[model samples]
Every structure is written in C-alpha cells, then in structure tokens.
Target: MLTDIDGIRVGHATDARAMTGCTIAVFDEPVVPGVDVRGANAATIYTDLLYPDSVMPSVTGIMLTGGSAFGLEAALGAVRYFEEQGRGYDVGVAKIPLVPAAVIYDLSVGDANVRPDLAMGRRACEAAKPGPFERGRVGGGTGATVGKLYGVRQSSPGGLGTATVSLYGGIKVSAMIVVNSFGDLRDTAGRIVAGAKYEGGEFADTYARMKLGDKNQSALARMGTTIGIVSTNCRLTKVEASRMATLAHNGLARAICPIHTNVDGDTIFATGLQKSDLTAPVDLLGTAAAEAAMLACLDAVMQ
Candidate 1:
C-alpha cells in the first residue's frame, strides 16, 4: 500500500449495508502535492490547493470515498480530526486543516440513500496506520464495479490495489488505487482480463463495444471513477509532482481499456513526502509511477 512510503498511513471505514466507505491516507507531516484529473465527470474537493502557487501549506491527508459528490462530507470529518490534532495551514483564523478529497460513484451497486458520512471519515482517520491493509471489496471500493457497458447487471467487482518500488538510490515510490471504471481491464497484449461478462462468461472488449454503442447514458454517467494516489520519498518540486502525475496516467492507459472517458472520473494524485535538495530523475520516477499504477490496477481486480 501507500504505507510503503515512510510517514504514510492508509486507513478505511466501511458501511457493510450501504457498501459505501471512505479511505484516508494520512501523512506524518505536511507534504508537497500534485494532481491530474483527465476524466470528464470527476467529483473532487480542495484540488485548488494543488495549483502552481496556492498559498496553502503542505497537505495533511487525502480522502477517497464512495458516495458521488455527497462523499465530500467525509472530508469534513478528516478536517475536524486534523484540527483536533492541531495540524493545518496556520492562517491565524484558527488553523484550517487542509485535506483534499475525491469521490467515486457507487450508488449503482449499494443502497444509494446511505452514503459515507462524517463518522465514517473520522473512523478512517482514527484507524490510520502503516498498515496491513486488505484489498478488493473494501474501503472506498466496497461498492465499486467495472464494465457496465450497457447497464449495471453485467458489471464485475472492482476494488482497491497498491504497489511499491524501490530504486537503488534509496528512492521509494508507491501507488494506491480504487478501480471503478466504465471500461474494461486489459493486459499489455490488449486482451480483456476483467470487464462486462456479456456473453458466456467472456470479457466484452470495451474498445470495440464503445464504437458500436447504442445507449445507456444514465448508468454510464452515474458510475465509474478510477482515483489513486502516488507517493514517493524522492525529492521533487510541486511542478515535478504534477508532471509525474501526468506521466503516471500511462499506467491507467496500460491497465484500463478506453480510460479517462467522458463519464469516467479518472484522477491521479502525486506527492513527494520527504524534504531534500537532492534531485531524483523525473523520467525514472514517472516511469516507476506508471508501472506501479499498472500493477496496482491489475491487482485491484485480481484480488
């Protein structure tokens, strides 16, 4: 998980009935952050902090939840917790806890009326740890499903995944993602691995199916949001972090067929958790982020 990066803690709070939950990635200290959102219908909050020259200090944590836009409520709980702990951007009007958040549409699978709430967010924050976290059908992924090509009936279970890599120069990079996508999952060979099992338990090649698309606009719009966080101990500027996030989308393009679609909320977050003057190679970091993201995506479903 992202816990592979020192000072990082990953936590989750799930509502078994609603099947919607929240995940929190809390850093031991403030960290530089960046984000790239390519999907057409993303649900996000506080992303303005990632802009080139935002006055906000470093980020305390990030919240990923399953409740569409309503999930933003969960971030308030995280903010409340941070404030209680005296961690935030000191603007003099009391310390304002800065936590950015993103959400995935999971109402199609679970009880829509019951979404992630403030309690769930606080629970996730309280549970934070350098963890032995579980994958698939848990956390923000509890209600996640993929391959809803025509409707919800044919979709497959999608969930959470994580990967970490260590370079020779003591640089460690990691990625964690929730896979709820509108399209299919594919391997490097362009073979569908997980997707709408439309036929005799076979994968529906999403790329081919889209061109022959006929309908199902509402379900397409209400489902699928592939969101993730990429963390590293290497030295990088906010600009470099942003560029790394852009490069990291190659991983999504690799593991997902027809990603960053108009209906899919595909977003990646990048962060440099350590402070240093030593510069790590951006190309190498980006490549590692891509590969880790790819592996994380595959691991999400395979689990």
Candidate 2:
C-alpha cells in the first residue's frame, strides 16, 4: 500500500523558475479498464474517456503535466521516448509503447510570459528518468495551489504528497496526490489542513462565512482542481479499481473545501495488478483508498 507495490514507480521533470514540469507514474503492466475520474476547474485534452470496463491492453506510462490542453503534446513525446528505450509491447514486427498523459492549468500562474510548448514536452520526455523522485514544487505541483478566494492572487501553495492504508489483512493501498484545489483544503475532521492564508499564515473562514450565506465576500468566487494516481498490488479488476479510485476522491472532498467544484479538474487514476488478493471485502479497499487520499493531501500541504 504505501509504495511497497512491486514494479510501481513515480518520477518527474520540473523547472523551478518556470513553475512547470511533468510527473510520470509508471506501472510495469497495463492499466486497462482502470477507472479515471476527472473533476476539474478547466478544460483539458484527453482527460476524459476512461471507464471500468474499457480495455487498455498496454499503458506504458502516465504523464501529469503543468501545461494546459497543449500539454498533451508531451504525451506524444513520452511515446517516442519509450520507443527508443526499447520499452513497449512486442507486436511481432515492432514494439509499441502506450503513454497516456494529462495536464493541469498551471500556465495562468507559471511563466504566463511564455506558455509551455512542445519543447517542454520534448524536454520532459528527455529528462524522464525512472522510479522515485523528490516531492512538492515538482511536476504538476510546481505551480499548483489551493484555496483561491477572491481570486488566484490569493491562492496558497500545494504540492505533491503520497499515503497508503492497510487492507485485506496486510495488503495496502497507496496514492500520490497533486493538491491543486480551487476552493481551498480541509480534512475529514473539517480542519483547515491546507489553503490560501494571509499574513502570518492567517486565513478567513470562507466556509463558516458562506454557511451564514454571506456569498458577497470574495470567498465563493473562483475554483480549481486536484489530480493524482493510486497504485496497488491487489489483483483487482478494472471495476474494483475504479471503485477504489472514486472512493479516493471522496477523501479528497473530505480534505478540500468545496472540492469537486464544477470548475476544478478532480481526476484520479487507479492501477491494480496481482500484488494482493481482491477477494477481500470491497469496503476494505474503498475505506483504505479514501483514507490514503486524505492523508496524502495533508502530507503535501501541511509540509
């Protein structure tokens, strides 16, 4: 569960100044039928079209980027990069690498002076290494933020975080979250775990104020999103995996104020292989994923 999964890896390429980069999540095997839920604040290319039954025979990799729709170009670059590395499925005549990618709307905050172009993707692919990497201020988290009240000018920093939970006796469920919610962050305890704060880390209670129906303030204005991936050794089918992913988002809602806002892109990916037994009760998997997601969010923002 918390990164003990075999052949499960996470990596990234970033530019601190530009506040842009790419995060790669790799599983040695395909992630077909994996459930993908995208709750976002902006439009993104290829962020949709995933279900519990669809067959993704071979998904070589997944790239989470900081660019907007244009960031999709990075995915193509990943495919090419993998091909040269002699990694991919052998189709008899040639090898094929399927690298599906997605992006977050960081251009607005990043080097808006210069949008992330194809070259960024190309360079990201070139810099793409293997396995574990540093957290926060990397990949999509480079420019990611949460708790945007009044406007983005008041957003707070949020970064990459990971967590896992015990399941099926000793099996586990782990995930890495790129916290970029538009409405701020909270926890199952309703604690202000992460959000845009003012001087001395002070912040207005947007929710409590809103509960008073005082929407006139700058609090309930702009919105954003959060994205991440979940990996497990459990031999779960796409449906079960998808269910686990959706449950993880529930944890996101628990940890973020106004989560899944119509404006934010809240996407989660779940990959499952024969690392554990799926025959265990489904509730165990769901609860574990939900808790893991919440813990992951806190680990990133509170840090």
Candidate 3:
C-alpha cells in the first residue's frame, strides 16, 4: 500500500533514561497491500514478509523496538493491547489481534544496565496513540546512533521522518522512516559531519575509510537496522509491496554507504491503503528515502 491515508496511527513508548522501548504504528483499517525488506540481524521471528513465502493472517498493528532481539517482546504487547481494543482479523465473528514487528540494536550504545523486557512492552502498549507520532529520540530510534567506534561518544543519533510524493492520474506514495544507519552519516552530496574526525570532519566518510584502510578497524556492525515504512494509495499485493520495500533500501544505500553492512540491520516495511495509483516515479522513492534518512539522522543528532 502506497497512497491512501486515513486511520494509520503511530505512537512511541520510550524510556529516556534507558533509551529502550517501542514504536507502535497502526494501520487500524484493513490493509489491502504490503511488503517487507530485511538485511542483517536475522534472529527475527516475525518478519516472513521479507521472504517469498509469507503468511500473515492479518495484522492490526506493527511495532519497531530496541533492546536488540529481546526488544521484539514489545510486538507481543502491542498485539495484546489491540486485542483489548477489539481490533484484529475477524475469526468466525471473533477478532484476534495479530501484529508484525521488528527490532534494532540500541543496547551497546544505550544504558546497558537496563534492557527492554516484557514489563517494558506492557507499558509501551499502554501508551500507544491513534494519531500523529513524536519522532527523533522517541520510540525505536531512541538509542540509535551513527558513526560509533568507542560507542555513542562520537556517533550522532538517528530519528524518524515522513515524506509524501504524488504522481499524475491519482498516484501517490508516502513513506516514514526511522533513521538508524550503522555508519557515520552525510548529506545527499556526501558531506561528512557528526562522526569520527580522525583526520578532520571537513570531508571523507569517516566510517567508510576506517573499514577500508584498516582491517583492524570496526565499522557499524551488521547488527544495525534502519527501519522504514512505505504506505501507498495504490493497490498492491504482498509481492509488489516486497519489491517496493527492497527498492526503498536503494534509498538507504544512497544515504549510508557500504550500507546493509554486516554491522547494519536494514529493513523497510510496506503496507497498503485503498486508493490505487502510481505517484512517485521509480527514481523518486529511492532518492526520497535517502533524503528522509539523512534529515531524520540530523534531527536526531540535534535532539
């Protein structure tokens, strides 16, 4: 789904002290289309949408979380909450709430002493909203960083941002992304800042040169995952949405070089709305994702 927008809602349950929690974004209405893109951090139990063979029995909400894999527990909490609201797939006149979910690594860079467990998940579920979301250091991106070596000391935070692009004859694609690049970030033109200044912050991709010039050097790991959501007005199936999600990664590559690295867990989530049309050109989605990623990162850092 790429264009229709009405009942979609996103909310965040974050612990400022621990930098741990989740983001619950709901497609409260029935979703007609969707897809997913996954790169690293493969222990995930709920992401079959990224594979050719996926069986989602209809989901009420989606959750993005932190505390690494343990963070996935938040999704369970989200489902439980939705169930309470009587939202889910209609099963013989009974509604059973089911939700899709994903998580990224924010432990090593966050308050490591405390982690997001079931209790945190439960609390997050209680805080979900049915409308506009608070981005930046709020939700899953709370502890996300870019260009970390000695950890977050030198890294800039990543945030969340949305972009909408429209095309002729009623075609529209809109996207929201949580900028969690695994490496130092740069502008669309590749200008470096807020990263390792081993040489100088004026230029050069700090994270990239480190990996290339020294075998001993460590870059953002494959554990890093930048999550994104693409909602379109166009009618599509799981397969087409999957392709759109993969294409969205092209946006990540445009912004994070040597992207989808062994250190980065990059994924894109696609869901559908009822309207049907192609608004964003193929080239625009990639470019837009990159733009949103960079801006989100910049905002998070400043936050």
Candidate 4:
C-alpha cells in the first residue's frame, strides 16, 4: 500500500446505498508534490497548487471522491480537519490547509443525488491509520465502472488497488490507483482482462466493435475518471516529481487500453517523502513508480 512509505495513512468513507464514496491520504508531515493531467474531461480542486512553479511547497492532504463536481465539497472536510490539527500554510492571522482533490462520476450507477459530502470526508480522515486496508467497492471506487464504450449495462465493476516495491539502497516506490476508464483493462500479455461482457460469457471487444462501424455514442463518455498517486522515499525536486507523474501515465496507457481519451479525466500525483544524499538514482525511481502503478491498476480490477 502507499502508506508503506512511512508517515502516510490512508482512509476511506463509503456510501454503499448511494454507490459513491471517498478516499483520503494524510501525511504526517508536508511533502513535496507534483501532478500530470491527461484527458479532456476533468473535475478537480487545488490541482494548480501542485504545479512545479506553484508557491506552495507541499500539501498536507489528498482527496479522491465519487460525487462528480458536487463531491468537491468533501475537500472542505479535509481542510477543516487540518485546521483543527494546526496543519496548513500560515497567513499571519490564520492558517489555510492545502488539500488537492479530484472526483469520479458515478451518478449513473445508483442514487444520483447522493455523493461523498463534507461529513463523510471528515469521517474518512478520522478513520485513517497505517497498515493494511480494504479495497474494491469502497472509497472513491464505489461506483467506478469500466468498459463504458457501450453503456453501464455492458460495463464491469472497478475499484481501488495498491502496489509497492523495495529497491536497492533502501529506496522504495508505491502507488494507489482507481480503475475507471473509457476503455477496457488489459493484461501484460495484451489481452482484455475486464470490460463489456456478453450474456453467453464472451467478452465484448470494444475496439473491434468501434472499428467494425459501431458509431453509437453517448454522454457516458464523460462519466469516468482514473486517478492515482505515486509515492517514493527518494528526495526529488518538484520538476522531477512532475516528470515522474508524466512517466506514470505510460503505465496507465500500458494497462488500460485506449486510455486518456477525449471523454476521460486521467490524472496522477507524485510525491517524495524522504530526502536523498543525491545518490538514489532518480531515473530508477521513476521506473519503479511506473512499474508499481501498472501493477496497481491491474490489482484494482483483479480484486
């Protein structure tokens, strides 16, 4: 899990009846952060702060929720929690917590009016702790569905997944990902692992169907988002972290067929939690990050 990197705790709050939920990642201390965004459709908050040229050095919290745009309210709960804990940027008279957030669209699956709100966000923070946690149909992955190239009826379940690796010289890299995409999930062998399924148990070849002249299109194209985070113990500048995020996107492309489409919002956040003596081999760190992210993405659907 991502929390294996020390000082990081992950938590989840789910609304099963609503088919929506939220996930929170809290850092014991502020850490340098960066992000890379792909796809044309996106709904998020505070992503600008993670830019390499941004004034904010780090963010105290990260939130991924399943409420579409309305779910952004959940970020307020995290900010409030940080405020009470005295964690944030000092602004002379008060402190404002820096919390970057993103959301997935799941209204078509269940109760559309219901979403992860401020209270649930608070509960997630309260539930956060170190060690293992549950995955699948929880947190930001609750209503997540893939293979929507057709519609919800043909789509399959999607969820959260995590992966970690211990490299030489005490270096470590990890990733947490939610699998919600505009295309199918593929295995390392280039086979479609999960996507639209037929009544007779045969897989629906979305790409083939599209190429065979299935031009039917729907607004569902705007209903999915794949978001994730990659963490490493090696020290890195904000630019390097951003570059790491860019490379992590390659992992998504490798694991998710037809990824980063016009209707999807694919984004990744990268952070460095430990300082290095300038000998941790930054290139290798990025490679590990991509590998972990690929494994994590497969884990989400395999779960």
Best by lDDT: 1
Residue 39 error, candidate 4, Å:
1.5
- Give the winner by TM-score: 1 or 2: 1
Give the candidates in order of TM-score, highest first: 4, 1, 2, 3
What TM-score would candidate 2 get against the native? 0.85
In candidate 3, which residue ranges exceed 4 Å CA deviation? 1-4, 49-52, 122-126, 197-204, 215-224, 274-303
Instruction: Let me know the TM-score candidate 3 reaches against the reference structure.
Output: 0.81
Q: Candidate 4 residues 1-303, lDDT tens each?
A: 998886789999998898999998888855778899886777888988788898755588788888888988888988888898888888889888877888877888989999888898888889989998778878989999887766777788999989998898777899999888868888889888887666565677777887887642545543446899998877778888888888888889888877887777788888886455533656777788889999988888888
Off by over 4 Å in 4: 216-218, 222-224, 274-279
Q: Pairs clashing in candidate 1?
A: none
C-alpha lDDT score of every prediction, in listed order: 0.84, 0.67, 0.61, 0.82
Judging by lDDT, tell me the better candidate of 1 and 3.
1
Go through the candidates in order and give the C-alpha RMSD of each one to the true structure: 2.0, 3.4, 3.8, 1.9
Tens-place lDDT digits, model 2, residues 1-303: 234655656666677887877777766655543555556344444434346545545667666777766667767777777777788889988788776565666765758544345556556656544445567777767877777654556667888888877664557788788887766677666767666565467776556655777442233334326777777666777678778877777788778877776657677777777444445555677777778888888877765
Would you list the rank order by lDDT, best first? 1, 4, 2, 3
Model 4: number of clashes?
0
